[PDB]
Amino acid sequence: SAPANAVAADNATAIALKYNQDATKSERVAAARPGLPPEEQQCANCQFMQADAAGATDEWKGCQLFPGKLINVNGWCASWTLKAG
Ligand code: SF4
């Protein structure tokens, strides 16, 4: 089940960032952010994802832009940035 501090779709920051916990429902194709075909972009391959966040699970991870909350590994927002090694 989902953690109580999962980012909600109606959170003001979520709305400002165009976050969707399901990337397939997001505006990723239209946003065409660089580095990777948009249909492969998700929190899992984003520079801002923080896997060592409190409460992280296989599905729910931290994000630098959402302090104290958890995003969905399969989500996306308009700040998506390709993770560099
Ligand atoms: S910045 Fe990256 S990890 Fe955070 S919600 Fe947006 S796409 Fe997901």
PDB file of N, CA and C and ligand atoms in Angstrom:
ATOM      1  N   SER A   1       0.817  -1.222   0.000  1.00  0.00           N
ATOM      2  CA  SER A   1       0.000   0.000   0.000  1.00  0.00           C
ATOM      3  C   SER A   1       0.850   1.273   0.000  1.00  0.00           C
ATOM      4  N   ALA A   2       0.211   2.374  -0.405  1.00  0.00           N
ATOM      5  CA  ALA A   2       0.972   3.596  -0.647  1.00  0.00           C
ATOM      6  C   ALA A   2       1.342   4.279   0.665  1.00  0.00           C
ATOM      7  N   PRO A   3       2.533   4.864   0.765  1.00  0.00           N
ATOM      8  CA  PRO A   3       2.954   5.540   1.990  1.00  0.00           C
ATOM      9  C   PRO A   3       2.164   6.831   2.225  1.00  0.00           C
ATOM     10  N   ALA A   4       2.007   7.202   3.492  1.00  0.00           N
ATOM     11  CA  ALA A   4       1.221   8.385   3.786  1.00  0.00           C
ATOM     12  C   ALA A   4       1.847   9.679   3.295  1.00  0.00           C
ATOM     13  N   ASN A   5       3.155   9.692   3.066  1.00  0.00           N
ATOM     14  CA  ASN A   5       3.804  10.858   2.508  1.00  0.00           C
ATOM     15  C   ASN A   5       4.140  10.713   1.025  1.00  0.00           C
ATOM     16  N   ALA A   6       3.422   9.859   0.304  1.00  0.00           N
ATOM     17  CA  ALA A   6       3.513   9.890  -1.151  1.00  0.00           C
ATOM     18  C   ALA A   6       3.060  11.279  -1.637  1.00  0.00           C
ATOM     19  N   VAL A   7       3.747  11.821  -2.647  1.00  0.00           N
ATOM     20  CA  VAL A   7       3.290  13.066  -3.239  1.00  0.00           C
ATOM     21  C   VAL A   7       1.917  12.859  -3.868  1.00  0.00           C
ATOM     22  N   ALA A   8       0.983  13.715  -3.439  1.00  0.00           N
ATOM     23  CA  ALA A   8      -0.372  13.679  -3.959  1.00  0.00           C
ATOM     24  C   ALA A   8      -0.466  14.502  -5.243  1.00  0.00           C
ATOM     25  N   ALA A   9      -1.353  14.054  -6.137  1.00  0.00           N
ATOM     26  CA  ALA A   9      -1.446  14.702  -7.434  1.00  0.00           C
ATOM     27  C   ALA A   9      -1.911  16.119  -7.367  1.00  0.00           C
ATOM     28  N   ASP A  10      -2.570  16.492  -6.268  1.00  0.00           N
ATOM     29  CA  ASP A  10      -3.110  17.834  -6.113  1.00  0.00           C
ATOM     30  C   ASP A  10      -2.263  18.675  -5.180  1.00  0.00           C
ATOM     31  N   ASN A  11      -1.091  18.218  -4.793  1.00  0.00           N
ATOM     32  CA  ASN A  11      -0.140  19.014  -4.036  1.00  0.00           C
ATOM     33  C   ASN A  11       0.284  20.179  -4.906  1.00  0.00           C
ATOM     34  N   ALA A  12       0.423  21.399  -4.362  1.00  0.00           N
ATOM     35  CA  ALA A  12       0.774  22.551  -5.167  1.00  0.00           C
ATOM     36  C   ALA A  12       2.092  22.349  -5.912  1.00  0.00           C
ATOM     37  N   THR A  13       3.090  21.726  -5.282  1.00  0.00           N
ATOM     38  CA  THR A  13       4.347  21.511  -5.954  1.00  0.00           C
ATOM     39  C   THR A  13       4.182  20.526  -7.095  1.00  0.00           C
ATOM     40  N   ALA A  14       3.427  19.454  -6.862  1.00  0.00           N
ATOM     41  CA  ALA A  14       3.131  18.483  -7.899  1.00  0.00           C
ATOM     42  C   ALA A  14       2.510  19.158  -9.126  1.00  0.00           C
ATOM     43  N   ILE A  15       1.502  20.004  -8.896  1.00  0.00           N
ATOM     44  CA  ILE A  15       0.837  20.686  -9.986  1.00  0.00           C
ATOM     45  C   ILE A  15       1.800  21.600 -10.717  1.00  0.00           C
ATOM     46  N   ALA A  16       2.614  22.358  -9.976  1.00  0.00           N
ATOM     47  CA  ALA A  16       3.574  23.263 -10.605  1.00  0.00           C
ATOM     48  C   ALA A  16       4.592  22.497 -11.460  1.00  0.00           C
ATOM     49  N   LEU A  17       4.952  21.314 -11.013  1.00  0.00           N
ATOM     50  CA  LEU A  17       5.952  20.490 -11.742  1.00  0.00           C
ATOM     51  C   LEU A  17       5.354  19.554 -12.769  1.00  0.00           C
ATOM     52  N   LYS A  18       4.025  19.540 -12.907  1.00  0.00           N
ATOM     53  CA  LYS A  18       3.360  18.602 -13.817  1.00  0.00           C
ATOM     54  C   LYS A  18       3.725  17.156 -13.444  1.00  0.00           C
ATOM     55  N   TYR A  19       3.855  16.874 -12.151  1.00  0.00           N
ATOM     56  CA  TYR A  19       4.103  15.515 -11.719  1.00  0.00           C
ATOM     57  C   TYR A  19       2.882  14.652 -11.926  1.00  0.00           C
ATOM     58  N   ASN A  20       3.128  13.435 -12.381  1.00  0.00           N
ATOM     59  CA  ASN A  20       2.133  12.369 -12.418  1.00  0.00           C
ATOM     60  C   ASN A  20       2.838  11.104 -11.899  1.00  0.00           C
ATOM     61  N   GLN A  21       2.228  10.420 -10.957  1.00  0.00           N
ATOM     62  CA  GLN A  21       2.852   9.203 -10.411  1.00  0.00           C
ATOM     63  C   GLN A  21       2.844   8.074 -11.433  1.00  0.00           C
ATOM     64  N   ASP A  22       2.097   8.229 -12.541  1.00  0.00           N
ATOM     65  CA  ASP A  22       2.103   7.280 -13.649  1.00  0.00           C
ATOM     66  C   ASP A  22       2.622   8.038 -14.886  1.00  0.00           C
ATOM     67  N   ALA A  23       3.892   7.803 -15.223  1.00  0.00           N
ATOM     68  CA  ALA A  23       4.493   8.552 -16.346  1.00  0.00           C
ATOM     69  C   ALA A  23       3.696   8.398 -17.642  1.00  0.00           C
ATOM     70  N   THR A  24       3.011   7.267 -17.832  1.00  0.00           N
ATOM     71  CA  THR A  24       2.304   7.079 -19.087  1.00  0.00           C
ATOM     72  C   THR A  24       1.159   8.072 -19.208  1.00  0.00           C
ATOM     73  N   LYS A  25       0.729   8.653 -18.110  1.00  0.00           N
ATOM     74  CA  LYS A  25      -0.380   9.612 -18.112  1.00  0.00           C
ATOM     75  C   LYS A  25       0.152  11.030 -18.118  1.00  0.00           C
ATOM     76  N   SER A  26       1.446  11.252 -18.094  1.00  0.00           N
ATOM     77  CA  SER A  26       2.085  12.542 -17.946  1.00  0.00           C
ATOM     78  C   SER A  26       2.240  13.235 -19.300  1.00  0.00           C
ATOM     79  N   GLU A  27       2.766  14.426 -19.250  1.00  0.00           N
ATOM     80  CA  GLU A  27       3.030  15.194 -20.467  1.00  0.00           C
ATOM     81  C   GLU A  27       4.416  15.018 -21.012  1.00  0.00           C
ATOM     82  N   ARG A  28       5.081  13.900 -20.791  1.00  0.00           N
ATOM     83  CA  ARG A  28       6.475  13.633 -21.078  1.00  0.00           C
ATOM     84  C   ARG A  28       6.730  13.679 -22.590  1.00  0.00           C
ATOM     85  N   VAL A  29       5.815  13.132 -23.368  1.00  0.00           N
ATOM     86  CA  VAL A  29       6.040  13.120 -24.836  1.00  0.00           C
ATOM     87  C   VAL A  29       6.062  14.541 -25.350  1.00  0.00           C
ATOM     88  N   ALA A  30       5.078  15.353 -24.930  1.00  0.00           N
ATOM     89  CA  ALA A  30       5.053  16.749 -25.356  1.00  0.00           C
ATOM     90  C   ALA A  30       6.214  17.557 -24.828  1.00  0.00           C
ATOM     91  N   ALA A  31       6.654  17.262 -23.601  1.00  0.00           N
ATOM     92  CA  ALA A  31       7.742  18.023 -23.025  1.00  0.00           C
ATOM     93  C   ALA A  31       9.086  17.753 -23.705  1.00  0.00           C
ATOM     94  N   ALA A  32       9.294  16.544 -24.236  1.00  0.00           N
ATOM     95  CA  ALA A  32      10.455  16.186 -25.027  1.00  0.00           C
ATOM     96  C   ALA A  32      11.744  16.668 -24.354  1.00  0.00           C
ATOM     97  N   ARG A  33      11.877  16.355 -23.066  1.00  0.00           N
ATOM     98  CA  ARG A  33      13.125  16.688 -22.344  1.00  0.00           C
ATOM     99  C   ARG A  33      14.300  15.929 -22.920  1.00  0.00           C
ATOM    100  N   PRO A  34      15.496  16.484 -22.887  1.00  0.00           N
ATOM    101  CA  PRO A  34      16.633  15.909 -23.617  1.00  0.00           C
ATOM    102  C   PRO A  34      17.197  14.658 -22.978  1.00  0.00           C
ATOM    103  N   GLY A  35      17.852  13.855 -23.846  1.00  0.00           N
ATOM    104  CA  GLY A  35      18.752  12.815 -23.391  1.00  0.00           C
ATOM    105  C   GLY A  35      18.213  11.416 -23.545  1.00  0.00           C
ATOM    106  N   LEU A  36      16.907  11.248 -23.735  1.00  0.00           N
ATOM    107  CA  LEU A  36      16.316   9.918 -23.697  1.00  0.00           C
ATOM    108  C   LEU A  36      14.956  10.022 -24.359  1.00  0.00           C
ATOM    109  N   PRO A  37      14.533   9.050 -25.161  1.00  0.00           N
ATOM    110  CA  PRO A  37      13.158   9.082 -25.722  1.00  0.00           C
ATOM    111  C   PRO A  37      12.117   9.319 -24.613  1.00  0.00           C
ATOM    112  N   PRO A  38      11.195  10.213 -24.809  1.00  0.00           N
ATOM    113  CA  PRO A  38      10.287  10.564 -23.685  1.00  0.00           C
ATOM    114  C   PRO A  38       9.550   9.378 -23.094  1.00  0.00           C
ATOM    115  N   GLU A  39       9.182   8.395 -23.896  1.00  0.00           N
ATOM    116  CA  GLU A  39       8.414   7.268 -23.393  1.00  0.00           C
ATOM    117  C   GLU A  39       9.219   6.333 -22.515  1.00  0.00           C
ATOM    118  N   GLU A  40      10.501   6.617 -22.343  1.00  0.00           N
ATOM    119  CA  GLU A  40      11.343   5.902 -21.393  1.00  0.00           C
ATOM    120  C   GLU A  40      11.670   6.731 -20.161  1.00  0.00           C
ATOM    121  N   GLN A  41      11.249   7.988 -20.089  1.00  0.00           N
ATOM    122  CA  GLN A  41      11.581   8.868 -18.960  1.00  0.00           C
ATOM    123  C   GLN A  41      10.677   8.586 -17.768  1.00  0.00           C
ATOM    124  N   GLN A  42      11.279   8.381 -16.623  1.00  0.00           N
ATOM    125  CA  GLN A  42      10.499   8.179 -15.393  1.00  0.00           C
ATOM    126  C   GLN A  42      11.397   8.521 -14.202  1.00  0.00           C
ATOM    127  N   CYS A  43      10.773   8.585 -13.018  1.00  0.00           N
ATOM    128  CA  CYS A  43      11.570   8.963 -11.854  1.00  0.00           C
ATOM    129  C   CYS A  43      12.775   8.026 -11.670  1.00  0.00           C
ATOM    130  N   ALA A  44      12.631   6.731 -12.012  1.00  0.00           N
ATOM    131  CA  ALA A  44      13.673   5.775 -11.821  1.00  0.00           C
ATOM    132  C   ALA A  44      14.974   6.181 -12.493  1.00  0.00           C
ATOM    133  N   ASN A  45      14.930   6.897 -13.635  1.00  0.00           N
ATOM    134  CA  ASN A  45      16.158   7.268 -14.367  1.00  0.00           C
ATOM    135  C   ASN A  45      16.408   8.769 -14.292  1.00  0.00           C
ATOM    136  N   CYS A  46      15.874   9.426 -13.284  1.00  0.00           N
ATOM    137  CA  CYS A  46      16.021  10.859 -13.101  1.00  0.00           C
ATOM    138  C   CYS A  46      17.131  11.184 -12.097  1.00  0.00           C
ATOM    139  N   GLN A  47      17.865  12.253 -12.428  1.00  0.00           N
ATOM    140  CA  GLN A  47      18.915  12.771 -11.600  1.00  0.00           C
ATOM    141  C   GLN A  47      18.460  13.131 -10.195  1.00  0.00           C
ATOM    142  N   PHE A  48      17.215  13.575 -10.031  1.00  0.00           N
ATOM    143  CA  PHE A  48      16.723  14.073  -8.751  1.00  0.00           C
ATOM    144  C   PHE A  48      16.206  12.969  -7.854  1.00  0.00           C
ATOM    145  N   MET A  49      16.012  11.762  -8.347  1.00  0.00           N
ATOM    146  CA  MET A  49      15.483  10.680  -7.495  1.00  0.00           C
ATOM    147  C   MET A  49      16.498  10.332  -6.415  1.00  0.00           C
ATOM    148  N   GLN A  50      16.004  10.077  -5.180  1.00  0.00           N
ATOM    149  CA  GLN A  50      16.787   9.777  -4.005  1.00  0.00           C
ATOM    150  C   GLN A  50      16.296   8.435  -3.449  1.00  0.00           C
ATOM    151  N   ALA A  51      17.024   7.385  -3.783  1.00  0.00           N
ATOM    152  CA  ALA A  51      16.514   6.062  -3.354  1.00  0.00           C
ATOM    153  C   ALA A  51      16.688   5.835  -1.857  1.00  0.00           C
ATOM    154  N   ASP A  52      17.629   6.525  -1.201  1.00  0.00           N
ATOM    155  CA  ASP A  52      17.850   6.296   0.234  1.00  0.00           C
ATOM    156  C   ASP A  52      16.966   7.187   1.115  1.00  0.00           C
ATOM    157  N   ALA A  53      15.826   7.624   0.660  1.00  0.00           N
ATOM    158  CA  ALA A  53      14.875   8.354   1.453  1.00  0.00           C
ATOM    159  C   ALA A  53      14.159   7.485   2.488  1.00  0.00           C
ATOM    160  N   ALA A  54      13.775   8.114   3.583  1.00  0.00           N
ATOM    161  CA  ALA A  54      13.031   7.498   4.660  1.00  0.00           C
ATOM    162  C   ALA A  54      11.738   6.951   4.095  1.00  0.00           C
ATOM    163  N   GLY A  55      11.508   5.647   4.370  1.00  0.00           N
ATOM    164  CA  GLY A  55      10.305   5.027   3.877  1.00  0.00           C
ATOM    165  C   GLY A  55      10.348   4.520   2.453  1.00  0.00           C
ATOM    166  N   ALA A  56      11.478   4.626   1.746  1.00  0.00           N
ATOM    167  CA  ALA A  56      11.585   4.198   0.372  1.00  0.00           C
ATOM    168  C   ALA A  56      11.336   2.677   0.308  1.00  0.00           C
ATOM    169  N   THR A  57      10.691   2.265  -0.775  1.00  0.00           N
ATOM    170  CA  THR A  57      10.409   0.865  -1.074  1.00  0.00           C
ATOM    171  C   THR A  57      10.748   0.604  -2.526  1.00  0.00           C
ATOM    172  N   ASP A  58      10.435  -0.576  -3.024  1.00  0.00           N
ATOM    173  CA  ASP A  58      10.718  -0.835  -4.431  1.00  0.00           C
ATOM    174  C   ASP A  58       9.937   0.092  -5.358  1.00  0.00           C
ATOM    175  N   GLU A  59       8.782   0.559  -4.956  1.00  0.00           N
ATOM    176  CA  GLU A  59       7.910   1.417  -5.720  1.00  0.00           C
ATOM    177  C   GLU A  59       8.012   2.915  -5.387  1.00  0.00           C
ATOM    178  N   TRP A  60       8.359   3.328  -4.207  1.00  0.00           N
ATOM    179  CA  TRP A  60       8.291   4.681  -3.687  1.00  0.00           C
ATOM    180  C   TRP A  60       9.684   5.139  -3.276  1.00  0.00           C
ATOM    181  N   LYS A  61      10.133   6.271  -3.839  1.00  0.00           N
ATOM    182  CA  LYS A  61      11.481   6.722  -3.628  1.00  0.00           C
ATOM    183  C   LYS A  61      11.450   8.225  -3.315  1.00  0.00           C
ATOM    184  N   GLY A  62      12.543   8.776  -2.823  1.00  0.00           N
ATOM    185  CA  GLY A  62      12.603  10.194  -2.599  1.00  0.00           C
ATOM    186  C   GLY A  62      12.817  10.948  -3.888  1.00  0.00           C
ATOM    187  N   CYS A  63      12.593  12.273  -3.819  1.00  0.00           N
ATOM    188  CA  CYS A  63      12.951  13.192  -4.889  1.00  0.00           C
ATOM    189  C   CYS A  63      13.460  14.463  -4.231  1.00  0.00           C
ATOM    190  N   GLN A  64      14.592  14.950  -4.719  1.00  0.00           N
ATOM    191  CA  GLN A  64      15.145  16.190  -4.179  1.00  0.00           C
ATOM    192  C   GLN A  64      14.159  17.365  -4.172  1.00  0.00           C
ATOM    193  N   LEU A  65      13.256  17.409  -5.133  1.00  0.00           N
ATOM    194  CA  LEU A  65      12.333  18.526  -5.291  1.00  0.00           C
ATOM    195  C   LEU A  65      11.101  18.427  -4.398  1.00  0.00           C
ATOM    196  N   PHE A  66      10.875  17.289  -3.737  1.00  0.00           N
ATOM    197  CA  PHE A  66       9.742  17.039  -2.877  1.00  0.00           C
ATOM    198  C   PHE A  66      10.276  16.618  -1.507  1.00  0.00           C
ATOM    199  N   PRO A  67      10.938  17.484  -0.765  1.00  0.00           N
ATOM    200  CA  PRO A  67      11.460  17.102   0.570  1.00  0.00           C
ATOM    201  C   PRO A  67      10.398  16.529   1.472  1.00  0.00           C
ATOM    202  N   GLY A  68      10.760  15.438   2.134  1.00  0.00           N
ATOM    203  CA  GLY A  68       9.883  14.819   3.125  1.00  0.00           C
ATOM    204  C   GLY A  68       8.795  13.945   2.527  1.00  0.00           C
ATOM    205  N   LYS A  69       8.778  13.825   1.196  1.00  0.00           N
ATOM    206  CA  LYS A  69       7.757  13.047   0.511  1.00  0.00           C
ATOM    207  C   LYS A  69       8.407  11.971  -0.331  1.00  0.00           C
ATOM    208  N   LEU A  70       7.575  11.104  -0.891  1.00  0.00           N
ATOM    209  CA  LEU A  70       8.007  10.027  -1.768  1.00  0.00           C
ATOM    210  C   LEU A  70       7.263  10.120  -3.098  1.00  0.00           C
ATOM    211  N   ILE A  71       7.994   9.960  -4.198  1.00  0.00           N
ATOM    212  CA  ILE A  71       7.412   9.817  -5.527  1.00  0.00           C
ATOM    213  C   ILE A  71       7.352   8.363  -5.889  1.00  0.00           C
ATOM    214  N   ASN A  72       6.718   7.983  -6.945  1.00  0.00           N
ATOM    215  CA  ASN A  72       6.534   6.735  -7.551  1.00  0.00           C
ATOM    216  C   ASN A  72       7.673   6.542  -8.549  1.00  0.00           C
ATOM    217  N   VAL A  73       8.352   5.417  -8.471  1.00  0.00           N
ATOM    218  CA  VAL A  73       9.450   5.136  -9.406  1.00  0.00           C
ATOM    219  C   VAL A  73       9.017   5.201 -10.853  1.00  0.00           C
ATOM    220  N   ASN A  74       7.739   4.966 -11.121  1.00  0.00           N
ATOM    221  CA  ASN A  74       7.154   5.010 -12.450  1.00  0.00           C
ATOM    222  C   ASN A  74       6.517   6.329 -12.790  1.00  0.00           C
ATOM    223  N   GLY A  75       6.762   7.351 -12.003  1.00  0.00           N
ATOM    224  CA  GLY A  75       6.179   8.681 -12.222  1.00  0.00           C
ATOM    225  C   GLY A  75       7.090   9.498 -13.157  1.00  0.00           C
ATOM    226  N   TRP A  76       6.704  10.778 -13.288  1.00  0.00           N
ATOM    227  CA  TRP A  76       7.435  11.720 -14.144  1.00  0.00           C
ATOM    228  C   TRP A  76       6.998  13.108 -13.760  1.00  0.00           C
ATOM    229  N   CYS A  77       7.893  14.102 -13.887  1.00  0.00           N
ATOM    230  CA  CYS A  77       7.494  15.495 -13.818  1.00  0.00           C
ATOM    231  C   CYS A  77       8.367  16.273 -14.814  1.00  0.00           C
ATOM    232  N   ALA A  78       7.988  17.518 -15.040  1.00  0.00           N
ATOM    233  CA  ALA A  78       8.623  18.353 -16.063  1.00  0.00           C
ATOM    234  C   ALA A  78      10.018  18.810 -15.699  1.00  0.00           C
ATOM    235  N   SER A  79      10.498  18.488 -14.516  1.00  0.00           N
ATOM    236  CA  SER A  79      11.886  18.663 -14.162  1.00  0.00           C
ATOM    237  C   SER A  79      12.754  17.421 -14.383  1.00  0.00           C
ATOM    238  N   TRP A  80      12.177  16.365 -14.928  1.00  0.00           N
ATOM    239  CA  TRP A  80      12.909  15.166 -15.226  1.00  0.00           C
ATOM    240  C   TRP A  80      14.244  15.508 -15.922  1.00  0.00           C
ATOM    241  N   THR A  81      15.306  14.893 -15.437  1.00  0.00           N
ATOM    242  CA  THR A  81      16.643  15.126 -15.962  1.00  0.00           C
ATOM    243  C   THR A  81      17.347  13.792 -16.021  1.00  0.00           C
ATOM    244  N   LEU A  82      17.976  13.419 -17.108  1.00  0.00           N
ATOM    245  CA  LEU A  82      18.646  12.114 -17.167  1.00  0.00           C
ATOM    246  C   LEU A  82      19.716  11.957 -16.100  1.00  0.00           C
ATOM    247  N   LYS A  83      19.636  10.847 -15.362  1.00  0.00           N
ATOM    248  CA  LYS A  83      20.633  10.537 -14.385  1.00  0.00           C
ATOM    249  C   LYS A  83      21.954  10.269 -15.070  1.00  0.00           C
ATOM    250  N   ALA A  84      22.962  11.007 -14.605  1.00  0.00           N
ATOM    251  CA  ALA A  84      24.315  10.748 -15.039  1.00  0.00           C
ATOM    252  C   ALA A  84      24.998   9.746 -14.169  1.00  0.00           C
ATOM    253  N   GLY A  85      25.859   8.942 -14.803  1.00  0.00           N
ATOM    254  CA  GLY A  85      26.704   8.320 -13.719  1.00  0.00           C
ATOM    255  C   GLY A  85      27.654   9.523 -13.433  1.00  0.00           C
TER     256      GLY A  85
HETATM  257  S1  SF4 B   1      12.342  15.547 -10.510  1.00  0.00           S
HETATM  258 FE1  SF4 B   1      12.718  13.518 -11.349  1.00  0.00          FE
HETATM  259  S2  SF4 B   1      12.460  12.077  -9.561  1.00  0.00           S
HETATM  260 FE2  SF4 B   1      11.523  14.030  -8.975  1.00  0.00          FE
HETATM  261  S3  SF4 B   1       9.304  13.753  -9.538  1.00  0.00           S
HETATM  262 FE3  SF4 B   1      10.340  14.789 -11.306  1.00  0.00          FE
HETATM  263  S4  SF4 B   1      10.912  13.097 -12.700  1.00  0.00           S
HETATM  264 FE4  SF4 B   1      10.433  12.176 -10.624  1.00  0.00          FE
END
